[PDB]
Amino acid sequence: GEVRTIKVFTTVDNINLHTQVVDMSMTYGQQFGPTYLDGADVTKIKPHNSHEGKTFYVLPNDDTLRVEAFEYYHTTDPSFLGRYMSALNHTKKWKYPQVNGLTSIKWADNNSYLATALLTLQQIELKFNPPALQDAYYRARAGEAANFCALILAYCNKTVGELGDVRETMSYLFQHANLDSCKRVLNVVGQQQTTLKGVEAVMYMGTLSYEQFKKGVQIPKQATKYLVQQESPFVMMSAPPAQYELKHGTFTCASEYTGNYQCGHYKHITSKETLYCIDGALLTKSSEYKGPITDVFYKENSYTTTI
Numbered sequence: 001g002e003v004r005t006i007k008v009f010t011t012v013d014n015i016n017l018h019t020q021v022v023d024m025s026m027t028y029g030q031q032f033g034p035t036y037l038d039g040a041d042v043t044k045i046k047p048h049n050s051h052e053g054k055t056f057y058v059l060p061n062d063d064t065l066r067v068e069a070f071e072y073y074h075t076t077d078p079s080f081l082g083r084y085m086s087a088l089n090h091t092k093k094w095k096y097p098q099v100n101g102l103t104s105i106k107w108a109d110n111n112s113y114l115a116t117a118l119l120t121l122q123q124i125e126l127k128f129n130p131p132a133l134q135d136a137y138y139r140a141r142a143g144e145a146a147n148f149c150a151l152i153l154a155y156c157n158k159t160v161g162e163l164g165d166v167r168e169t170m171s172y173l174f175q176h177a178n179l180d181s182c183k184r185v186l187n188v189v190g191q192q193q194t195t196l197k198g199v200e201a202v203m204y205m206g207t208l209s210y211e212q213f214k215k216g217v218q219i220p221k222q223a224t225k226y227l228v229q230q231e232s233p234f235v236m237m238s239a240p241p242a243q244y245e246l247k248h249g250t251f252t253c254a255s256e257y258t259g260n261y262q263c264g265h266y267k268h269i270t271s272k273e274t275l276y277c278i279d280g281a282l283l284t285k286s287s288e289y290k291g292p293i294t295d296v297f298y299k300e301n302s303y304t305t306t307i
């Protein structure tokens with residue numbers, strides 16, 4: 001029968017577009033391989049008249065596409081693009097309410113960890129290295145966060161509907177950020193000093209209190225570890241969830257966690273004119289706070305001990 005054609009664009013990064021002429025009598029998969037339209041898998045579908053001029057994602061199947069994908073995402077995992085598209089097909093349907101100019105996410109698909117991470121990322125100073133994260137983060141800050149959320153799911157190898165860990169999520173994203181100038185000097189009292197750089201310089205697991213880290217924490221005979229010097233724009237202090245008192249103006253933000261390991265619920269606590277509890281789309285305020293906290297973030301620039 002008749003052979004009709006339309007013009008479309010293919011891409012791996014939505015920056016470099018490659019004009020294609022498509023045969024409407026064949027499926028996209030027969031012509032391109034796995035093919036996606038705004039996240040939806042159209043590999044098994046034939047071109048529709050309405051697809052003319054639209055942009056489709058394809059898997060990198062030639063060296064030009066391979067280079068474009070790597071330069072944009074900073075990954076060689078061949079499953080990455082398909083996982084990113086599968087997540088986007090869901091996150092494009094989430095809602096992203098603004099809370100005091102912070103983009104949150106209405107609860108869906110056990111995404112409380114992602115809303116809490118997204119809110120945190122808008123409150124600390126971070127520069128991503130992969131252009132894909134740079135571009136999507138800028139959009140997310142302005143309220144259009146579906147692509148950023150799908151990329152986070154793909155980078156962290158999380159499926160939509162799976163509850164993830166905020167500390168683990170932030171840690172992996174930090175591996176894609178420019179933290180090269182961050183430095184931490186510790187003394188453990190023999191008396192021994194160590195210097196950490198990069199992501200290890202901004203994370204700690206064992207106490208929520210930055211002040212306690214400065215004064216000294218006991219670690220295994222028992223010794224005292226304390227912070228000698230900190231050069232970073234923030235620090236993330238974490239510990240297994242425990243009841244904790246947060247005081248206005250003494251922290252930047254924090255992760256509240258209720259429930260059991262791997263199956264509970266996160267909320268986000270931030271300090272503004274009072275304490276805000278952002279719970280996806282829901283906001284409550286209170287002058288005081290006591291509750292189960294598992295991460296606290298503190299802004300920083302340069303700290304030097306007086307010990």
Ligand SMILES: Cc1ccc(N2C[C@H]3C[C@@H](C2)N3)cc1C(=O)NC1(c2ccc3c4c(cccc24)C(=O)N3C)CC1
Nearest residue numbers: 163164165166168239240241257260261262263264294
């Ligand atoms: C919410 C979530 C999602 C995923 C995961 N996972 C852990 C390992 C496996 C893969 C994914 N990776 C953990 C949590 C979780 O529940 N994470 C916290 C937690 C709760 C209760 C805890 C702990 C402890 C140590 C560290 C974290 C933690 C602990 O000792 N208890 C009793 C932050 C909430």
Ligand SMILES: [Zn+2]
Nearest residue numbers: 110111112265
């Ligand atoms: Zn949840």
Ligand SMILES: [Zn+2]
Nearest residue numbers: 190221222223
């Ligand atoms: Zn000792």
